[PDB]
Amino acid sequence: SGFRKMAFPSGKVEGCMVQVTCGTTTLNGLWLDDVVYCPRHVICTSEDMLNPNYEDLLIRKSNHNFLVQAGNVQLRVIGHSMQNCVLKLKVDTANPKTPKYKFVRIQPGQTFSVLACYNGSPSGVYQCAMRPNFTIKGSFLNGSCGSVGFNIDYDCVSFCYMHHMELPTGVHAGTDLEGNFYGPFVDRQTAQAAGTDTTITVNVLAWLYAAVINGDRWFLNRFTTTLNDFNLVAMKYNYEPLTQDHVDILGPLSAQTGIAVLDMCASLKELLQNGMNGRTILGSALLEDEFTPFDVVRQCSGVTF
Amino acid sequence: SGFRKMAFPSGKVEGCMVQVTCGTTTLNGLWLDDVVYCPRHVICPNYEDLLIRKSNHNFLVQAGNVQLRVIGHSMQNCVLKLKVDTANPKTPKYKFVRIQPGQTFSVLACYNGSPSGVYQCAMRPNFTIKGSFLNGSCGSVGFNIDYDCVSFCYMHHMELPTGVHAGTDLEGNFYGPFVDRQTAQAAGTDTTITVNVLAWLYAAVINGDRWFLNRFTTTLNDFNLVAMKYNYEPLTQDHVDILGPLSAQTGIAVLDMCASLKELLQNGMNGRTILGSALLEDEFTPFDVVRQCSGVTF
Ligand SMILES: O=C(Nc1cncc2cc(F)ccc12)[C@]12C[C@H](C1)Oc1ccc(Cl)cc12
Ligand SMILES: O=C(Nc1cncc2cc(F)ccc12)[C@]12C[C@H](C1)Oc1ccc(Cl)cc12
Ligand SMILES: [Cl-]
């Protein structure tokens, strides 16, 4: 029993964190085999950030301008290249702690663990979700750039995010490990603002199924809804449209609890209308949207209470 | 910016997790140097009588794909200590520490000696933890990290009828009035950790959430009458002293923030949130707030 925002154990990622220094800037890098991956803005001055020409800044650099530190050991840089917004530093030593890994690009609504680091030293781990507006509500201070997001299903680490910047509203933007940004963001200090965010509907439904699994049904009702009527109502509360893909994905949780997806959709409609009335669901007074259908199945028991 | 329920990096603890099997029971053990620590209920009660009938070879200890050989066994309170023939080469610098209610720690939840997740939690005033554990989680541990030293503070033993969890320190002493057996046990009425709620209100102010601030101040006596009425733990002069740094950073005196908390307790939030929460959060200590708003590394 119980339901917590759970992160993956971070050990396999901790053994990959390094410090990258270029001039006066120090940030974090990810050391996998003989390559260190880090945000390309490590080569920028603050002035450069308004309109940086990364190709022009990079051509003026040599291997010995990049200082890479792994624990108490200095790694020697023997090559460098840029791939989109990521800098790849070839080093002379392969990481003996390199786990089994993949680079995966995730979609909005997907969750992942973040290992927040400063000076190549891990400080904490937390669970989060890629928002529909492509930002993440993280907890990052200056020096956290290069910190990574990942999932660990089985013994393989799937790296999905690398931290690049904080937006004016306090939310965070970054790239996949191939250096492609999530969202319409640029690694440039321009007027960039996150689009209006929405609630991840399929995740709220998954979390309502988790509440039923743990033994709570106060919020259920005797009604059903069509998918289109559900979407016309939920969009009035800034909820993401629920697609047939989301309904198919919720199939297993529907079969486990005996509650049809569209009947759980009717319960969500009523919750949006009435609020909780002094009650909580899994110890929360808000409808939680940072647990996916996959996270609920992984964390919850296979036997409904 | 941002404020998340953050756990310590779990790597140093992952390298200590093993699987302990005794008969039909499989649970988790903590391998430090040449000793494996695990709940004594793995042998299940008259624990001395059950233990005397066991030999070293009855305990199967598995570390990854390797079987460790048990060469000795002893009991210390509610913890079983299995002497093994191999010292853990991944043993970090560590201490066994007993924590107090209100203090927080990270839990590495394990099943079959394999870590599955990490989360942050607090020892409730009623000595239970609101964790997330299924069958097979027994022996999972709670810890904090200071510099490079792991301080182990909790080992999971059982789930109570309300879905909350109970366990011991690493010396086998239970937190709370609990016993390790299948019997009628209930957690006492819980209370809110007042000093932690105040720390979280200071974290909100540091992050730009100031709507709850007011011009008023109060006294410890007046506030404690309000806290007692709303099932909040009493606030002591020690708690006020501990909140000193956050008070100096934000310019809001502790009894000034207490007057804000009193108004939140008597009027609610009025459709508003604080750090994305509609409830007053009590699982961040004053130290956790200072650490997350400073970036301390290990
Ligand atoms: O946003 C940035 N760094 C921060 C990342 N996360 C949390 C932060 C919290 C802070 F209070 C400050 C900077 C943060 C900065 C560092 C300065 C701005 O130059 C930059 C150049 C390029 C890019 Cl894409 C980003 C940045
Ligand atoms: O409480 C227990 N185990 C569980 C620990 N955590 C989460 C659990 C979640 C569950 F759904 C079931 C058992 C859990 C049990 C195993 C049965 C009861 O015999 C016991 C004897 C002594 C002790 Cl201290 C504990 C137990
Ligand atoms: Cl995805």
Q: Are residues B184 and B195 located together in one domain of the fold?
A: no
Q: Are residues B8 and B140 located together in one domain of the fold?
A: yes
Q: Are residues A2 and A78 located together in one domain of the fold?
A: no
The secondary structure of residue A16, as a DSSP letter, is T
Measured CA to CA, the distance from residue A17 to residue A74 in angstroms comes to 13
- Domain endpoint, select from A197, A214, A242: A197
CA A39 to chain centre: 16
Q: Are residues B116 and B226 located together in one domain of the fold?
A: no
Q: Are residues B255 and B147 located together in one domain of the fold?
A: no
* Residue B121 forms contact with A (CB below 8 Å): yes
Q: Are residues A215 and A282 located together in one domain of the fold?
A: yes
Q: Are residues A296 and A204 located together in one domain of the fold?
A: yes
Measured CA to CA, the distance from residue A77 to residue B39 in angstroms comes to 49
In chain B, the N- to C-terminal Cα span, in Å, equals: 21
Measured CA to CA, the distance from residue A280 to residue A223 in angstroms comes to 21
What are the strands, taking DSSP E only, across B244-286?
A: none
C-beta separation of A293 from A300 below 8 A: no
β partners of residue A175: A162, A181
Q: Which residues contact residue B61 at a Cβ distance below 8 angstroms, ignoring those fewer than 6 apart?
A: B18, B19, B20, B21, B29, B31, B36, B67, B68, B69, B70, B82, B84
Reference A170, options A187, A190, A194; nearest CA is A194
Reference A163, options A181, A177, A175; nearest CA is A175
β partners of residue A91: A77
What are the strands, taking DSSP E only, across chain B?
A: 17-22, 25-32, 35-39, 59-63, 66-68, 70-76, 79-84, 93-96, 104-111, 114-122, 141-146, 149-159, 165-168
Which residues in chain B are contacts of A12 at CB distance < 8 A? 11
User: Contact B7/A166, CB-based, under 8 Å?
Assistant: no
Strand-strand pairing, B93-96 and B149-159: parallel
Q: Are residues A134 and A174 located together in one domain of the fold?
A: yes
Which residues in chain A are contacts of B8 at CB distance < 8 A? 124-125
Q: Are residues A22 and A70 located together in one domain of the fold?
A: yes
Backbone angles phi, psi at B121, to 5 degrees: -155, 180
Reference A146, options A16, A9, A54; nearest CA is A16
* Helix (H) or strand (E) run with residue A30 in it: strand A25-32
Residue A260, domain extent: 198-301
Q: How far is the CA of B50 from the centre of ligand 3 (A)?
A: 50
Measured CA to CA, the distance from residue A191 to residue A291 in angstroms comes to 31
Half-sphere exposure of A47 (CA within 13 A, CB side): 1
What is the experimental method?
A: X-ray
- Residues of B assigned a catalytic role: 41, 138
* Residue B46 forms contact with A (CB below 8 Å): no
Q: Which residues contact residue B49 at a Cβ distance below 8 angstroms, ignoring those fewer than 6 apart?
A: none
Q: Are residues B185 and B197 located together in one domain of the fold?
A: no
For every residue of B166-200, DSSP letters joined together read EEE-TTSPBSSS--SSSS---PPPP-B-HHHHHHH
How many angstroms separate the Cα of B127 from the Cα of each of A5, B136, B145, B166?
A: 21, 22, 21, 7
- Domain endpoint, select from B69, B92, B115: B92
CATH number for the domain harbouring residue B257 = 1.10.1840.10
CATH number for the domain harbouring residue A29 = 2.40.10.10
3-state secondary structure of A116: strand
- Residues enclosing ligand 1, CB less than 6 A? A 41, 44, 49, 140-142, 144-145, 164-166, 187; B 1
Q: Are residues B146 and B8 located together in one domain of the fold?
A: yes
User: Contact B207/A2, CB-based, under 8 Å?
Assistant: no
Q: Are residues A136 and A10 located together in one domain of the fold?
A: yes
Measured CA to CA, the distance from residue B4 to residue A140 in angstroms comes to 10
- Domain endpoint, select from B190, B210, B234: B190
Measured CA to CA, the distance from residue A67 to residue A263 in angstroms comes to 58
Total domain count, chain B:
3
C-beta separation of A133 from A196 below 8 A: yes
Measured CA to CA, the distance from residue A141 to residue A118 in angstroms comes to 9
* Residue A283 forms contact with B (CB below 8 Å): yes
Q: Which two tokens stand for residue A227?
A: 């998918």
